[PDB]
């Protein structure tokens, strides 16, 4: 199908390595980095939609990061 829930949600924990351990880190980072590198303009759009929201500076930067993560997954 299309959905296929990932099993890392229920990561079975023990001393031995799991099925695909060496891949998780670069998996997520690579997906996000490639999507942002393909479409730069959404960085500007996200900066604006952040700056319009949130009073302080820290809240606005948290907004920028959360948008820049939620978009590449279309989550």
């Amino acid at each position: 199908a299309v959905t296929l829930p990932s099993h890392s949600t229920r990561k079975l924990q023990t001393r031995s390595q799991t099925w695909l351990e060496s891949r998780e880190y670069t998996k997520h980072l690579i997906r996000v980095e490639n999507w942002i590198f393909r479409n730069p303009g959404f960085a500007l759009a996200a900066a604006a939609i952040a700056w319009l929201l949130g009073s302080s500076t820290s809240q606005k930067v948290i907004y920028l990061v959360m948008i820049l993560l939620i978009a590449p997954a279309y989550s």
Partner: peptide
Amino acid sequence: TALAGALEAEMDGAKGRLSS
């Protein structure tokens, strides 16, 4: 790739010997 983070196992005959 959906089975990311699940334990492997090996099996001989009816019995299967876990690894962890």
